[PDB]
Design a protein around this nucleic acid. Structure first.
Lengths: 157, 197, 127, 106
RNA sequence: UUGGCGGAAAGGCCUUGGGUGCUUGCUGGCGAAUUGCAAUGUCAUUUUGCGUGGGGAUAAAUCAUUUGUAUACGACUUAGA
RNA sequence: GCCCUGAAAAUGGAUGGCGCUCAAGCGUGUUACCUAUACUCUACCGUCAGGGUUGAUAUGAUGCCCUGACGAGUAGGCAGGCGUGGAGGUCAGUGACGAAGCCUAGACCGUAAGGUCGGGUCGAACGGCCUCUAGUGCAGAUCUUGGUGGUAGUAGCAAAUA
RNA sequence: GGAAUACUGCCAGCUGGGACUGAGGACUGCGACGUAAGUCAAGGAUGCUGGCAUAAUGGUUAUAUGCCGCCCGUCUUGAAA
RNA sequence: GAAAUUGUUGAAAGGGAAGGGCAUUUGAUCAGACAUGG
């Protein structure tokens, strides 16, 4: 033989884990994140866009809108840590918004007629409330960017 | 925070200016120093002419052509100072100096480019009053710089052109600040003022 | 196709080449420890070649494992191949260099049959 | 919007180092506009990228990125310590670098 | 396109007149999604070759030979349609 | 007290260099900051120590397992291993359908000595494990023998009339 | 005469940002919160989501860049000499 | 049919030696993957 056979050999029994003691407790957002707050998206597909916070979905995410007929962003998930939350803010009393959860966004190309409809539902009330304050609508459609001699660490937003 | 920085050499102290400039390069800042002839050294003329001569007697004993080189012109006198503060024999050092230009007088492109000053190297901010000092040009011309008078003649001709230029400019900003008077107190004026502007 | 095992950490992947092996042909890369009296390497001055010491030893839990997760086993034939029958997630087989091409198809056959992983198939292989 | 920038300008100054020994595992960045360690505490954790060109296209681009993060402050004047997923080339000592605004905890 | 001005490396600057694109100075009508919660999404200017269509121009230097104001050898100075 | 005089040497030169004058100099004080193979917590290697466990209970009792501490090293001592020629025993071991050998900024294992594989070349033998044995491991000795370089197309190939 | 504040010190007072680590692998221990069944951050990480295919990633190698590195062997108090 | 040393081909580097160490850029090369209804 080419190699003398080993005298032990392990066991191919793959063991089970010890009862792990980690337990998911809810995530409390930071104070500046109240629903209706104008957000700045700092990353991804709609970075730079100014956008309206709506709902803290159960998978930690922030329901966003923008809204669509204002700047192009649809109802959309967005992570809190890639967002600047401004001081400016619209109301959201007259926006239903309960039908939207994780499963609403569940990956079950096309563009569902339910999604396009819900958009116009939710958006209608927002553009309604947005339009009272002058130049707010304008603002929301302009994109955010740093200028020469901006210092994020001091600017207020 | 800028493409290229043009520094009006006058009123600066050589070594203090050299140290701040030589650091800009190692950070990527493209530097171009001008009017190196009106550059200052603390300590009056005789000492620095004595010091320069103390540098002037050093050379390879068997072949002066290879021992220390003594560049006389003010622009290169300062360039001596700077390079001594950069690790130039290394590639990184080479590249840093390759971000720098030093000029006696202000020759073309920069002739219409705003020069800036370095306070921490500005003599009048750094020197104690009553202390004697030196004018680099007067020094260099006393150790073999053949062109103090040429740069002098040109600079006069240059400052004359600049004079009429600034006069033109001063006349237009007038119109702008005299055609503002109307818009000075409109609604949008008070509108702007509310937010700081 | 193999047991759990923690991420293999290798600690010092580089060779340890005998000092000046890179200086004179006559001196082999094969590690050899300097004995010399003033020697910088022996005296461990900053800037020189590191010498193999025991602190570099591999994790017992991952020691002797290849990327696949098995320890390899030198196989000469089917009898040898067959020792790894119960230990299919633990060991891999390596067909000896001197094993003839035709025999290599037979060991190769029997391994697939038994599910033993082979490290050097495409061995003495036509096409 | 001639401006599109959502990052703060930066410069790669050095590796961590003593007088005569360096540590390529840590990098020192000057952040544009930061002047004190109390300011530089704002950028702690933010993402850095060093962006460079190449000849070989990979995913259809000749533009490449080295990602890393701000980890702590350095010295007394806003300079900051950073570690990247790999380690910045050192050829880049003087090159530009990008400090982003995420993770925001604004 | 009408006038000027700039030689320190001017190689840029002022100026006349219209033409054309935009114009967020202001008021409307549309579009944006599904790039799926960040990762990869502005293309910069160097060179060098080739592909076209227009304008344009139609040489020298070296070896060899020759001189001796030159020359160790190269080199240098001559001359040859 | 600081400053000045007293204060003269041979290549050109040294507060380390630049350079510095309400210092970037001298005396004193207060904060902040940079950084060692040291200190603190943690993973892993090893060494030492203490302890648990073959009660029927498959494959390691010189074994599995738990815990704590420790790690500089010439001359030098001991230990555990790596490799070589030959010997007894055993894999009814590899092999002309390719042994041994050689080449290979190809691959894998070992902290290392080393081991293993692929490809190329090759052509008659050779290996693993348990033991036995020694004419058993080289970079040096103005070491031995042989082979080969730079020097170098170089010194030179000019006495004796042509 | 009534205070406040600084300085110093204690709190088994509350809390924001950043960093490195996640060894272990059924249960067994000491606890905590609950009237409770139960639950927990209590003898070592889990959950959710996404990304990678002639690709992410890692190994080696060549080069470049930053810092660093004198020739071994030897006798010697002392060798790069 | 080894090495020293050599020709050719190919890639690369080279401002008074070359070679080494830690690190990464770029280039070349090499990997481990393996199984899920048609």
């Amino acid at each position: 033989s080419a190699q003398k056979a080993p005298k032990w050999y392990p066991s191919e029994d793959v063991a089970a884990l010890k009862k792990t003691r980690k337990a998911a407790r809810p995530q409390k957002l930071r104070a500046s994140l109240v629903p209706g707050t104008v957000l700045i998206l700092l990353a991804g597909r709609f970075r730079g866009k100014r956008v309206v916070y709506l709902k803290h979905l159960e998978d930690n995410t922030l329901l966003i809108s923008g809204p669509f007929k204002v700047n192009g962003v649809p109802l959309r998930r967005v992570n809190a840590r890639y967002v600047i939350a401004t001081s400016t803010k619209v109301s959201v009393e007259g926006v239903n918004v309960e039908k939207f959860n994780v499963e609403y966004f569940a990956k079950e190309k096309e563009i569902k007629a339910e999604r396009v409809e819900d958009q116009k539902v939710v958006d209608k009330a927002l553009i309604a409330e947005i339009k009272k304050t002058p130049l707010l609508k304008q603002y929301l459609s302009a994109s955010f960017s740093l200028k020469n001699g901006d210092k994020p660490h001091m600017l207020k937003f | 925070v800028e493409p290229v920085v043009v520094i009006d050499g006058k009123g600066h102290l050589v070594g203090r200016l050299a140290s701040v400039v030589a650091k800009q390069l190692l950070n990527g800042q493209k530097i171009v120093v001008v009017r190196a002839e009106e550059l200052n050294i603390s300590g009056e003329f005789f000492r620095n002419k004595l010091k320069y001569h103390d540098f002037l007697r050093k050379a390879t004993a068997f072949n002066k052509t290879r021992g220390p080189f003594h560049f006389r012109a003010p622009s290169r006198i300062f360039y001596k100072a700077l390079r001594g503060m950069v690790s130039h024999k290394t590639a990184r050092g080479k590249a840093a100096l390759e971000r720098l230009k030093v000029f006696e007088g202000i020759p073309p492109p920069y002739d219409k480019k705003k020069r800036v000053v370095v306070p921490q190297a500005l003599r009048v901010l750094r020197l104690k009053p009553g202390r004697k000092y030196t004018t680099l040009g007067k020094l260099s011309t006393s150790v073999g710089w053949k062109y103090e008078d040429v740069v002098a003649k040109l600079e006069a001709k240059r400052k004359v052109s600049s004079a009429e230029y600034y006069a033109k400019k001063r006349a237009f900003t007038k119109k702008v600040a005299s055609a503002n008077a109307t818009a000075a107190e409109s609604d949008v004026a008070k509108q702007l003022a509310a937010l700081g502007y | 196709a193999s047991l759990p095992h923690p991420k293999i950490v290798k600690k010092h992947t580089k060779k340890f080449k005998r000092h000046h092996s890179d200086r004179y042909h006559r001196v082999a890369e094969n590690w050899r420890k300097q004995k010399g009296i003033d020697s910088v390497v022996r005296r461990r001055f900053r800037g020189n070649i590191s010498q193999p010491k025991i602190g570099y030893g591999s994790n017992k839990k991952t020691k002797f494992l290849s990327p696949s997760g098995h320890k390899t086993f030198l196989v000469a034939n089917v009898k040898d191949l067959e020792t790894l029958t119960m230990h299919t997630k633990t060991y891999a087989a390596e067909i000896a260099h001197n094993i003839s091409a035709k025999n290599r198809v037979v060991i190769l056959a029997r391994a697939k049959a038994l599910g033993i992983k082979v490290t050097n198939p495409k061995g003495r292989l036509a096409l | 919007a001639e401006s599109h920038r959502l990052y703060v300008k930066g410069k790669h100054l050095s590796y961590q180092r003593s007088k005569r020994v360096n540590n390529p595992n840590v990098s020192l960045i000057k952040i544009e506009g930061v002047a004190t360690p109390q300011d530089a505490q704002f950028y702690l954790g933010k993402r850095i990228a060093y962006v460079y060109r190449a000849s070989k296209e990979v995913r259809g681009s000749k533009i490449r990125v080295m990602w890393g993060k701000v980890t702590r402050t350095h010295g007394n004047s806003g300079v900051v310590r950073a570690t990247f997923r790999n380690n910045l080339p050192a050829k880049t000592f003087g090159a530009s670098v990008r400090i982003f605004l995420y993770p925001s905890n604004i």
